[PDB]
Symmetry: C5
Subunit: 212 residues, 5 copies
């Protein structure tokens, strides 16, 4: 009974991975749109001696590849499966103003659905460039960090959000810092280096030292 | 004789691991219950500048797979064996409010028994979100951290505990912090992101600074 | 959708032909020397530690070189003119900070852009602690420090370096840094060491900076 | 020159026969138990942190055991009596500090010595933080602490431990340490846990130390 | 174009001939012993912590040895006399600090230079924390500390060591370090241990240093 479902799932993964060579990533002729979102859990530290702030959050990443679709009826009605992020292509979404390598807090496992879509939710701790002047005031401090592909232009990787409101409903209630507001907004960057635009989602956080 | 038992173990492992492929993990039609329990060894530090607390504890993980069963009589009466956690599938049990990657303090080796049960006991150090206010009072401070699958819903991984009492019999007797109470409780919740419930075990610790008499 | 499928097979075939149908490039020799263009984009001076004389910089290191072994005719691969690939898939130059005090910490994906003429562009973002006395940083005149970059093991007969400009790119310098940049230059130098009879090449990064006020 | 060629050939053949022809030792069993000889050489107490009750030791661990599967006749292999090999080529015991607070940091190469009677010698140098209250370190009496080392997953029925002496080797203890050693002993102990019907064996390192005067 | 193509081919063939056509060198033995020439270049004393008696040093080690198994005739390979290769491609000696307090942090690419006579030059740069009491560092006489380097697992019957000079290279020492070096020596020694029937060889690096002053 369960033997058959296990066999079917193995067969599906072999047909998708071991049979077909890995996705070479997007191109101008085969571009990809990645949906990004942020769930802020904690501002751990705001360092005014170096202007770095440490955030704990997760990143919702979603995209769709035709090379990952399958007919459930042809695979025991399996409609999704979990797999190691190392078995699939994942986008190179990067903070543009980190000061330390990102520290990964969640399992590098993703969910693949029969329509070819992938959902990958990396939890992480990030130190980024942030002047916390005003954090000890009622108006608070405002910092910002952009997330995008490091190496793919908007012709290969476009980004989008499902909303411009950051999810603060999991934010730690006894953090040293309360969040006043947090937005997440698509932007188009034209850097002086590079003819091709680079797309990003800009996370803007207004925050202050917790005071009743 | 011992040469034989050694060959029997090598055979069993070859049969279990190298014959059928890796267990692809649970599915809604083949769901798995993971039994979780905690053994708290030390509250190492409570940082009020950041509201992070560092715990040293073990996490008892137990589950059972049909694909790991064998007949002991077909293998020289071997009833269990130890093996690298890399040789088997393991659940993606994750602290939901960690602030640093968890640091593993013990060997990544599991015990597999002939009924297909796996016992895995990783010791580790965790920093998590905790406001230690009141730690210097008679009432002490209270913090909590949930643990569960990151990627699997309750329809794929369920959790349970064998007791609601955290195991304190190995708690370091000269810690800077004394434990007032430690409980572990199964919870079910919905997140706005997904239509399925997710299961966690919530570790709640009440603690205060040790004082001399 | 077949056209998207075709474009993918073209890319998969090109990489297969460049990488898997030949052994990696063995690096440069006296007979086939390489020129690496180096350029720096200063993002932030994060920290200036006067107790240890170390300064920490966040910057991109632009690296560019060209190999005949990476050339292809786009017309034979459906007009594919460039592609992105893991820096592990190709040879990369061993460009090293000569006065680092800690291992460089990499902040961006290790992915390069390869073009049909055989040119490679690799732009790693990095945090570097290097040797620097920040005395004067809290004055109008400010502090001056310098760090040299070059091959560790190739002399100027095998790896030559150049810059496209002597001016460090400051267009991405963090506007609310603790430190403002008075000037930042990048200059090719040639050195002889006592060890070795051949000259080594480096690019010297000189940065003048002061506490923002 | 030719003879060195023969010697190298003989060693490569031995290693190939021991490692590539037969599978790796699956570890000890109830029917084929193993005794590991364990001893400690304490080099330094680096740090004692009274705010977290963690002490940091630098030491080496002497580990020795013997496997029939690693035996060979020297006459079959050009009179070779022993060799050095990566610890990855062989099974090693999962000897673990029961009260560490951070992952152990390895200071020496992961290479072991294998002798023709199947005995193995492995001497990992390490830095360990462990649970220790340094109260009294600033007195003439000093402070005492203890840390036990044993297998994480094998009971006394699979791995037994022994010591050649109960005296910790202090002959390489750093003479200018912040802490002088008053005593250091290593004692086999048998412990029962409520979790487990089988006892586990450990070597308990007890150190008495004080601030150098 | 065609001259460069050819030289690349010769090098590719040489490396294949050295690495794939025989298994990787099993290291030295009593019958096939090796001498490593060792030397130190000190770049910076970054930190001297008197709360724990640890000093942090950035330096590089010059390591040289020679193997018959890495020899070739340049005339057979387009007159190639040397090449650069990943240190993972070759055996390297397990030269270890005897009194480190933290793992070494590597600051240079792990690549060595191989020459047709079978000699290997490997120059690992690193930051080392080692056991060192800095008392007297705030005085004219300074502080003196020492750290030995040698093989961890091979005795003198398998790995011998030599220096080219007793004078540590201080020419590249960081001129604006918090600490000035008064002197640095590097001396071969023989150590006998109770564990083992034969002695182990080390180079003892002795450094006299003090807080930088003026005038
Ligand atoms: C997301 N991106 C990061 C920064 C901009 C965009 C693309 C990559 O940067 C570049 O290509 C260059 C930067 N500076 C340069 C100078 C000469 C050539 C290229 C670049 C990585
Ligand atoms: C234990 N889990 C963590 C958080 C909830 C549950 C499942 C995983 O989260 C998601 O799938 C999403 C979170 N936020 C989202 C937003 C849009 C789509 C998916 C998600 C990882
Ligand atoms: C950029 N480089 C670093 C330092 C100089 C140049 C080449 C490499 O060093 C050497 O080969 C030697 C240094 N000191 C030595 C002493 C004896 C033999 C060789 C060397 C690495
Ligand atoms: C050295 N060892 C460490 C601790 C005891 C011995 C064996 C391992 O622990 C267990 O199996 C359990 C601990 N607590 C438990 C609770 C339920 C089931 C098993 C255990 C790891
Ligand atoms: C450089 N070396 C370090 C220390 C001496 C030499 C060889 C290695 O040590 C041993 O084998 C033992 C030390 N102490 C012991 C006690 C019983 C058995 C072996 C050893 C590592």
């Amino acid at each position: 009974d369960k033997l058959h479902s296990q066999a079917n799932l193995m067969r599906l993964k072999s047909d998708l991975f071991n049979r077909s060579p890995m996705y070479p990533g997007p191109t101008k002729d085969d571009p990809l749109t990645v949906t990004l979102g942020f769930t802020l859990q904690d501002i751990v530290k705001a360092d005014s001696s170096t202007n770095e702030v440490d955030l704990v959050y997760y990143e919702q990443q979603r995209w769709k590849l035709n090379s990952l679709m399958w007919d459930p009826n042809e695979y025991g009605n399996i409609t999704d499966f979990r797999t190691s992020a190392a078995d699939i292509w994942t986008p190179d979404i990067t903070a543009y103003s980190s000061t330390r390598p990102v520290q990964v807090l969640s399992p590098q496992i993703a969910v693949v659905t029969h329509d070819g879509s992938v959902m990958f939710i990396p939890a992480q701790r990030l130190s980024f460039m942030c002047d916390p002047t005003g954090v000890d005031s009622e108006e608070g401090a405002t910092c910002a960090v952009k997330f995008g592909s490091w190496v793919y232009s908007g012709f290969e990787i476009d980004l989008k959000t499902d909303t411009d409101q950051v999810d603060l409903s999991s934010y730690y209630a006894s953090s040293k810092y309360e969040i006043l507001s947090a937005t997440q907004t698509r932007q188009v960057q034209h850097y002086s280096c590079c003819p091709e635009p680079y797309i990003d989602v800009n996370l803007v956080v207004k925050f202050r030292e917790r005071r009743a």
